[PDB]
């Protein structure tokens, strides 16, 4: 909700921390998977400085497509949200599980 | 003209006010425009009226001369300022070109045109009438300024940013800024063509010539960094489109890293691969490394010709394509740059072989009246036979021959001099 | 032999872009390793992409790719000069070994 709010001026700035703190928090935890995901949605709709902020977590993403669990619900959460994570590098890392997820 | 045409300018500080050095930036444009030229009317902050005036001044400013005309804009806090009328009542060889800088309205503005045009197209008819053509509106964080504004100036300047920005600059390192002037003489000459590849890549057939137009149209493609924002700022144009793609785009990337070394220190280089490495296997396909391709290349060759270069090996590789003709000979004339450049040098000896080989086979293409090029060949082409050599000139001399038998622009007296030299070697060759 | 036609590298490359299966790529690298130096025109940059594609793969978790970094690392080295003009693969990899234990 706060993420939902500002867009940017607070975004460019304080945010990077919490991204450490998603890293800090959860690898991700099963529930917080669903959360951070849907949170990164809130994130994902704002920056374009995701791009630098990317891959502390774009790492953990592939905890998940490899991990995985629960009906693929987690996946299709992240899976979709990635279509919000857009875009333009790192398909390097993106496609391989995805295609393996056909 | 010199500089080309009439141009418009605007800036949004807010509404009806000057500003420190806001004055100053305007000229920089006209400068930059002169760096690309022309009669440019600067403005600042105006309420709509003050603007409306000088439009009519340029609407008065006589562009039947100009080769085009421009309408610039910029960011004010969303100045609505004649969505339609002033625009649309000033509406569709001094060809108008419109320019937009918006958060949203850009397309809307463009959308508006057609819509307003839809009126100002159709609704004119029953009055039996504004015809949209040659009137175009081009569309538009930490380090920007105004991108799509800077974009066209600044063409390479902006480029250096998307260099430093970001992940690649790990490899080429490192950054600083500026300096590096006369080695940069090439980067333009390169980035000049580096786009035009994609152009000939994508053109089909809407295209150049007319200069400053394409000069934009080129610099347009610099918008593919667009990368900034998930609204990667997506300029819209309807006179396209790939951006992205266009391997030359991926190519200029390490064509930069070719420059990122020498800039570190001391320059020194100098050199760099690009034009060369592009030049080489242009023969490959030229020989038999292409199935129709579509030449894959020739666009590159054009600007490549202009320099001392490599000029021969190009002009060499030129005739190669002239050998692969007739089929691609048109494509040559599609590019036509021979007509540009081959005629552009009437200034050959060693080149006379290619000047034959390229130019003859060019001249062979049957045809375009040489016009003053006929006096130039009356100089150049005539003086070729001086050595009486080679058979490399055998029919090559006869290139210009039928021109006089084609139509009469004398072709008599300037031919009379040749009339002496022609029949002279005729029996001396004695070869059918 | 003969290898050239401008189409072909554009047809050669995509298999480097497979990557699947890994070792398939591992050929064309060397498979172009020569052809690299015929015309880097297509290649050198098509190449330069690859490391620029590849180098980022040092961060992303582990591994099965980070080894699928390894074999493609040298396999271009039959391409010489590019590798020369960069050699930041040092710094990347120099670190790659140090920090442990992953």
Swiss-Prot record, chain B:
Phosphoserine PTM positions: 45
Signal sequence bounds: none
Subcellular compartments: Lysosome membrane; Cytoplasm; Cytoplasmic granule
Posttranslational modification: O-GlcNAcylated by OGT upon glucose sufficiency, promoting interaction with small GTPases Rag (RagA/RRAGA, RagB/RRAGB, RagC/RRAGC and/or RagD/RRAGD) and subsequent recruitment of mTORC1 to lysosomal membranes, leading to activation of the mTORC1 complex.
Tissue specificity annotation: Highly expressed in skeletal muscle, and in a lesser extent in brain, lung, small intestine, kidney and placenta.
Domain of life of the source: Eukaryota
Function: Component of the mechanistic target of rapamycin complex 1 (mTORC1), an evolutionarily conserved central nutrient sensor that stimulates anabolic reactions and macromolecule biosynthesis to promote cellular biomass generation and growth. In response to nutrients, growth factors or amino acids, mTORC1 is recruited to the lysosome membrane and promotes protein, lipid and nucleotide synthesis by phosphorylating several substrates, such as ribosomal protein S6 kinase (RPS6KB1 and RPS6KB2) and EIF4EBP1 (4E-BP1).
UniProt subunit comment: Part of the mechanistic target of rapamycin complex 1 (mTORC1) which contains MTOR, MLST8 and RPTOR. mTORC1 associates with AKT1S1/PRAS40, which inhibits its activity. mTORC1 associates with DEPTOR, which regulates its activity. mTORC1 binds to and is inhibited by FKBP12-rapamycin. Forms a complex with MTOR under both leucine-rich and -poor conditions. Interacts with (via TOS motifs) EIF4EBP1 and RPS6KB1; interaction is independent of its association with MTOR.
Family the entry assigns: Belongs to the WD repeat RAPTOR family.
Stated name of the protein: Regulatory-associated protein of mTOR
Boundaries of the shown chain within the full protein: 78 to 668 of 1335
UniProtKB/Swiss-Prot annotation, chain C:
Subcellular location: Lysosome membrane; Endoplasmic reticulum membrane; Golgi apparatus membrane; Cell membrane
Start and stop residues of the HEAT repeats: 13-52, 55-97
UniProt superkingdom: Eukaryota
Post-translational modification: Autophosphorylates when part of mTORC1 or mTORC2. Phosphorylation in the kinase domain modulates the interactions of MTOR with RPTOR and AKT1S1/PRAS40 and leads to increased intrinsic mTORC1 kinase activity.
Tissues of expression: Expressed in numerous tissues, with highest levels in testis.
Domain comment as written in the entry: The kinase domain (PI3K/PI4K) is intrinsically active but has a highly restricted catalytic center.
Medical condition linked: Smith-Kingsmore syndrome: An autosomal dominant syndrome characterized by intellectual disability, macrocephaly, seizures, umbilical hernia, and facial dysmorphic features.
Family to which this protein belongs: Belongs to the PI3/PI4-kinase family.
Chain's role: Serine/threonine protein kinase which is a central regulator of cellular metabolism, growth and survival in response to hormones, growth factors, nutrients, energy and stress signals. MTOR directly or indirectly regulates the phosphorylation of at least 800 proteins. Functions as part of 2 structurally and functionally distinct signaling complexes mTORC1 and mTORC2 (mTOR complex 1 and 2).
Subunit structure, interactors included: Part of the mechanistic target of rapamycin complex 1 (mTORC1) which contains MTOR, MLST8 and RPTOR. The mTORC1 complex is a 1 Md obligate dimer of two stoichiometric heterotetramers with overall dimensions of 290 A x 210 A x 135 A. It has a rhomboid shape and a central cavity, the dimeric interfaces are formed by interlocking interactions between the two MTOR and the two RPTOR subunits.
Protein name (Swiss-Prot/TrEMBL): Serine/threonine-protein kinase mTOR
Annotated organism of origin: Homo sapiens (Human)
Recorded name of the encoding gene: MTOR
């Amino acid at each position: 909700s706060f993420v939902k709010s500002h867009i940017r001026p607070y975004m460019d700035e304080i945010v990077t921390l919490m991204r450490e703190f998603w890293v800090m928090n959860t690898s991700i935890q099963s529930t917080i998977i669903l959360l951070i995901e849907q949170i990164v949605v809130a994130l994902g709709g704002e920056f374009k400085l995701y791009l630098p902020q990317l891959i502390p977590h774009m790492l953990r993403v592939f905890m998940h497509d490899n991990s995985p669990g629960r009906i693929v619900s987690i996946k299709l959460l992240a899976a979709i949200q990635l279509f919000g994570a857009n875009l333009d590098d790192y398909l390097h890392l993106l496609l391989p599980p995805i295609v393996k997820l056909f | 003209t010199t500089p080309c045409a009439r141009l418009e300018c605007w800036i949004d500080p807010l509404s009806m006010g000057p500003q420190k050095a806001l004055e100053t930036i305007g000229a920089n444009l006209q400068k930059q425009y002169e760096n690309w030229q022309p009669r440019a009317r600067y403005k600042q902050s105006l309420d709509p009226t003050v603007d409306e005036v000088k439009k009519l001044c340029t609407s008065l400013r006589r562009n039947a001369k100009e080769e085009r005309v421009l309408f610039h804009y910029n960011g004010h806090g969303v100045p609505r300022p004649t969505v339609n009328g002033e625009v649309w009542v000033f509406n569709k060889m001094g060809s108008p070109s419109i320019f937009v800088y918006d958060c949203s309205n850009a397309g809307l503005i463009v959308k508006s045109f057609k819509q307003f045009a839809l009126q100002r197209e159709q609704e004119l008819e029953v009055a039996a009438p504004d015809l949209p053509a040659d009137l175009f509106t081009s569309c538009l964080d930490l380090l920007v300024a105004s991108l799509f504004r800077n974009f066209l100036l600044a063409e390479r300047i902006m480029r250096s940013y998307n260099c430093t920005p970001v992940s690649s600059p790990r490899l080429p390192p490192t950054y600083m800024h500026a300096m590096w002037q006369a080695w940069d003489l090439a980067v333009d000459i390169c980035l000049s063509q580096l786009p035009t590849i994609i152009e000939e890549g994508t053109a089909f057939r809407h295209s150049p010539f007319f200069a400053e137009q394409l000069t934009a149209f080129q610099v347009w493609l610099t918008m593919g960094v667009e990368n900034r924002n998930p609204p990667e700022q997506l300029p819209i144009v309807l006179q396209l489109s790939q951006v992205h793609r266009l391997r030359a785009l991926d190519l200029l990337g390490r064509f930069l890293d070719l420059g990122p070394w020498a800039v570190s220190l001391a320059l020194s280089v100098g050199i760099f691969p690009y034009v060369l490495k592009l030049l080489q296997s242009s023969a490959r396909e030229l020989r038999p490394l292409l199935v129709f391709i579509w030449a894959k290349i020739l666009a590159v060759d054009s600007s490549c010709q202009a320099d001392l270069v490599k000029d021969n090996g190009h002009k060499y590789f030129l005739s190669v394509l002239a050998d692969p003709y007739m089929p691609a000979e048109h494509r040559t004339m599609t590019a036509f740059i021979l007509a540009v450049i081959v005629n552009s040098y009437h200034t050959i000896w060693q080149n006379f072989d290619s000047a034959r080989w390229c130019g003859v086979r060019d001249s062979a293409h049957e045809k375009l009246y040489s016009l003053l090029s006929d006096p130039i060949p009356e100089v150049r082409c005539a003086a070729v036979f001086a050595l009486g050599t080679f058979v490399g000139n055998s029919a090559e001399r006869t290139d210009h021959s039928t021109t006089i038998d084609h139509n009469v622009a004398m072709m008599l007296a300037q031919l009379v001099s040749d009339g002496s030299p022609m029949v002279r070697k005729e029996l001396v060759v004695a070869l059918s | 032999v003969g290898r050239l036609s401008s189409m072909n590298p554009a047809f050669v490359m995509p298999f480097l872009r497979k990557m699947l299966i890994q070792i398939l790529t591992e050929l064309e690298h060397s498979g172009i390793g020569r052809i690299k130096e015929q015309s880097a025109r297509m290649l050198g940059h098509l190449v330069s992409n690859a490391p620029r594609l590849i180098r980022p793969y040092m961060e992303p978790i582990l591994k099965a790719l980070i080894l699928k970094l390894k074999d493609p690392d040298p396999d271009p080295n039959p391409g010489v000069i590019n590798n020369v003009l960069a050699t930041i693969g040092e710094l990347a990899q120099v670190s790659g070994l140090e920090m442990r234990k992953w």
